[PDB]
Short mmCIF file of C-alpha atoms in Angstrom, two decimals:
data_model
loop_
_atom_site.label_atom_id
_atom_site.label_comp_id
_atom_site.label_asym_id
_atom_site.label_seq_id
_atom_site.Cartn_x
_atom_site.Cartn_y
_atom_site.Cartn_z
CA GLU A 1 28.48 2.38 10.89
CA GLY A 2 25.57 0.46 9.51
CA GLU A 3 22.12 0.81 8.01
CA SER A 4 18.75 0.03 9.49
CA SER A 5 15.32 -0.19 7.94
CA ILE A 6 11.90 0.26 9.51
CA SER A 7 8.80 -1.16 7.91
CA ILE A 8 5.25 -0.69 9.08
CA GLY A 9 2.04 -2.20 7.83
CA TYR A 10 -1.47 -3.15 8.75
CA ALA A 11 -3.02 -6.58 9.17
CA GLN A 12 -5.40 -7.60 6.41
CA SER A 13 -8.13 -10.13 6.50
CA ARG A 14 -10.46 -11.60 3.87
CA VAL A 15 -13.81 -9.91 3.97
CA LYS A 16 -16.87 -10.12 1.76
CA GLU A 17 -18.47 -7.04 0.28
CA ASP A 18 -21.95 -7.17 -1.21
CA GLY A 19 -21.95 -3.49 -1.96
CA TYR A 20 -22.96 -2.92 1.65
CA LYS A 21 -20.78 -2.77 4.74
CA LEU A 22 -22.19 -6.00 6.04
CA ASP A 23 -18.73 -6.99 7.26
CA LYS A 24 -16.91 -4.67 9.57
CA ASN A 25 -13.29 -3.83 8.77
CA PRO A 26 -10.68 -5.70 10.82
CA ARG A 27 -8.32 -4.06 13.25
CA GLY A 28 -4.66 -5.01 13.57
CA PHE A 29 -1.21 -3.68 12.97
CA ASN A 30 2.37 -4.88 12.50
CA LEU A 31 5.81 -3.45 12.69
CA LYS A 32 9.10 -4.84 11.36
CA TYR A 33 12.62 -3.80 12.07
CA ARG A 34 15.68 -4.74 10.05
CA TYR A 35 19.01 -4.91 11.81
CA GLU A 36 22.17 -5.19 9.74
CA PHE A 37 24.92 -7.34 11.19
CA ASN A 38 28.28 -8.20 9.73
CA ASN A 39 27.39 -11.52 8.23
CA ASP A 40 26.22 -13.07 4.96
CA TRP A 41 22.62 -12.81 6.13
CA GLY A 42 20.78 -10.19 8.12
CA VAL A 43 18.12 -10.62 10.78
CA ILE A 44 14.78 -8.93 11.39
CA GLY A 45 12.33 -8.70 14.24
CA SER A 46 8.61 -8.50 13.66
CA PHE A 47 5.70 -7.74 15.94
CA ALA A 48 2.10 -8.31 14.96
CA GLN A 49 -1.15 -7.82 16.80
CA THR A 50 -4.64 -8.49 15.56
CA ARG A 51 -8.10 -8.56 17.04
CA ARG A 52 -10.15 -11.63 16.38
CA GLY A 53 -13.93 -11.51 16.61
CA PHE A 54 -17.00 -12.12 14.55
CA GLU A 55 -16.97 -9.03 12.36
CA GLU A 56 -19.23 -10.73 9.82
CA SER A 57 -22.95 -10.10 9.87
CA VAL A 58 -25.13 -13.17 9.96
CA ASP A 59 -27.88 -11.37 8.10
CA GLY A 60 -27.41 -7.71 8.79
CA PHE A 61 -26.71 -5.72 11.93
CA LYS A 62 -26.46 -9.05 13.72
CA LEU A 63 -23.25 -10.62 14.89
CA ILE A 64 -21.75 -12.51 17.84
CA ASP A 65 -20.20 -10.14 20.36
CA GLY A 66 -16.91 -11.33 21.69
CA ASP A 67 -13.46 -9.99 22.43
CA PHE A 68 -10.21 -11.76 21.70
CA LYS A 69 -6.79 -10.46 20.83
CA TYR A 70 -3.79 -12.33 19.55
CA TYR A 71 -0.27 -11.13 20.14
CA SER A 72 2.40 -12.64 17.95
CA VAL A 73 6.11 -12.04 17.83
CA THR A 74 8.32 -13.43 15.12
CA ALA A 75 11.89 -13.12 14.02
CA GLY A 76 13.98 -14.58 11.25
CA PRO A 77 16.75 -14.00 8.81
CA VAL A 78 16.71 -12.07 5.55
CA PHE A 79 18.04 -13.57 2.38
CA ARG A 80 19.04 -11.27 -0.48
CA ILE A 81 19.76 -12.82 -3.85
CA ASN A 82 21.83 -9.95 -5.21
CA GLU A 83 20.67 -6.32 -4.92
CA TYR A 84 17.36 -7.21 -6.55
CA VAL A 85 15.03 -8.85 -4.08
CA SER A 86 15.01 -9.89 -0.50
CA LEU A 87 13.11 -12.68 1.20
CA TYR A 88 12.12 -12.66 4.81
CA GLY A 89 11.31 -15.75 6.90
CA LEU A 90 9.05 -15.45 9.89
CA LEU A 91 9.18 -17.82 12.82
CA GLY A 92 7.92 -17.28 16.35
CA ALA A 93 4.98 -17.93 18.58
CA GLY A 94 1.68 -16.29 19.30
CA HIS A 95 -0.52 -16.07 22.36
CA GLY A 96 -3.91 -14.64 23.05
CA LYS A 97 -6.06 -14.55 26.13
CA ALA A 98 -9.12 -12.49 27.04
CA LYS A 99 -10.41 -14.15 30.19
CA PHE A 100 -10.61 -12.57 33.59
CA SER A 101 -11.63 -14.07 36.90
CA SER A 102 -9.53 -13.07 39.91
CA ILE A 103 -6.02 -11.91 40.45
CA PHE A 104 -5.92 -13.63 43.83
CA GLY A 105 -6.92 -17.22 44.40
CA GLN A 106 -5.85 -20.74 43.72
CA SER A 107 -7.02 -22.64 40.71
CA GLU A 108 -5.51 -24.84 38.06
CA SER A 109 -4.79 -22.97 34.82
CA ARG A 110 -4.00 -24.21 31.37
CA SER A 111 -2.35 -22.34 28.55
CA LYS A 112 -1.53 -23.16 24.94
CA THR A 113 1.14 -21.67 22.73
CA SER A 114 0.27 -20.94 19.17
CA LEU A 115 2.88 -21.58 16.52
CA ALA A 116 3.36 -18.59 14.27
CA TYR A 117 5.25 -18.81 11.06
CA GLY A 118 5.16 -17.09 7.71
CA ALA A 119 7.24 -15.55 4.98
CA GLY A 120 7.59 -12.17 3.33
CA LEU A 121 8.88 -10.81 0.09
CA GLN A 122 10.60 -7.48 -0.30
CA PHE A 123 10.46 -5.53 -3.54
CA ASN A 124 12.43 -2.35 -4.16
CA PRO A 125 11.12 -0.68 -7.27
CA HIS A 126 12.57 2.60 -6.09
CA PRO A 127 15.50 3.31 -3.80
CA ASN A 128 13.36 5.39 -1.54
CA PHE A 129 10.36 3.07 -1.58
CA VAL A 130 10.34 -0.49 -0.24
CA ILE A 131 7.34 -2.72 -0.60
CA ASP A 132 6.96 -5.32 2.11
CA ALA A 133 4.40 -8.03 1.50
CA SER A 134 4.18 -10.91 3.95
CA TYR A 135 1.81 -13.33 5.59
CA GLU A 136 1.61 -14.99 8.95
CA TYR A 137 -0.19 -18.21 9.78
CA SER A 138 -1.10 -19.05 13.34
CA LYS A 139 -1.40 -22.78 13.90
CA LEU A 140 -3.99 -23.62 16.50
CA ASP A 141 -6.24 -26.69 16.51
CA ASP A 142 -9.00 -24.76 18.27
CA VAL A 143 -8.99 -21.92 15.79
CA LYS A 144 -7.07 -21.58 12.57
CA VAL A 145 -6.01 -17.98 11.99
CA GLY A 146 -4.44 -16.67 8.84
CA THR A 147 -3.19 -13.11 8.69
CA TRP A 148 -1.96 -11.24 5.72
CA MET A 149 0.34 -8.27 6.23
CA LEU A 150 0.93 -5.47 3.79
CA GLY A 151 3.07 -2.42 4.42
CA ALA A 152 5.98 -0.38 3.20
CA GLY A 153 9.47 0.23 4.54
CA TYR A 154 12.07 2.95 4.34
CA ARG A 155 15.77 2.45 4.11
CA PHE A 156 18.56 5.03 3.91
#
């Protein structure tokens, strides 16, 4: 009694290529789900995860080892002009933490919430092929993180 669409994609990041794999490829993934409700606008849920680290080589075979992962969840409405294109809005929050100390003890802890927002455009050149291009920007004073997401979706 309705239609749903599932779109998957991979996180993309700007990298430099000098003809040599000086920069390591990034690792991340994203998944989007479209839920159709009886209304003038639909709503989607998006989940994105990316690993942040120094994947760039200072000179060659030299980098800063570190581990940090960001988990971001966003959701927003979908606006369709008229059976031609659809625009997606992303709004949510992100959080990442990769510190360990003790699971038992008493100490003051601090935490910050990253603001995640973005937008996506949907193109349907074919009825059985949906192109989903979107971007997500994580606002954090400590570290500015921009993530580009590219993927495809299937509907019907």
